[PDB]
């Protein structure tokens, strides 16, 4: 019965909107739910030179891209939370659901 939903997004408050939506769903459908486990954030860091050519004073850009991850566990059959997980899909957040 141990279904696991992994919510992954670049935006935090859009991730927290979908996360707080699925817990509201699990609780209003009377299901055992492990709260959202905040897995450590990953910082995709690339540092470039700023100039296209060579002859400017040595200046560097520092581009970052944070990626955030929650996972919520559920003790329930597949098709109930399938109807819940189909509800409230945002353009930003990315969902992956495993069964066992």
């Amino acid at each position: 019965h141990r279904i696991r939903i992994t919510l992954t997004s670049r935006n935090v408050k859009s991730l927290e909107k979908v996360c707080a939506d699925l817990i509201r769903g699990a609780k209003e459908k009377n299901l055992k739910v492990k709260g959202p486990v905040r897995m450590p954030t990953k910082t995709l860091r690339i540092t470039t030179r700023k100039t296209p050519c060579g002859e400017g004073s040595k200046t560097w850009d520092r581009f970052q891209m944070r990626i955030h991850k929650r996972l919520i566990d559920l003790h329930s059959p597949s098709e109930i939370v399938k109807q819940i997980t189909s509800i409230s899909i945002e353009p930003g957040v990315e969902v992956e659901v495993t069964i066992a």
Binding site: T8, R10, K42, L44, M65, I67, K69
Partner: peptide
């Protein structure tokens, strides 16, 4: 699926697709 790209490489691939 079988190739099974990492979240880092997947999200950059999603970004380059838009670019």
């Amino acid at each position: 699926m079988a190739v099974q790209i990492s979240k880092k490489r997947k999200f950059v691939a999603d970004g380059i697709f838009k670019a």
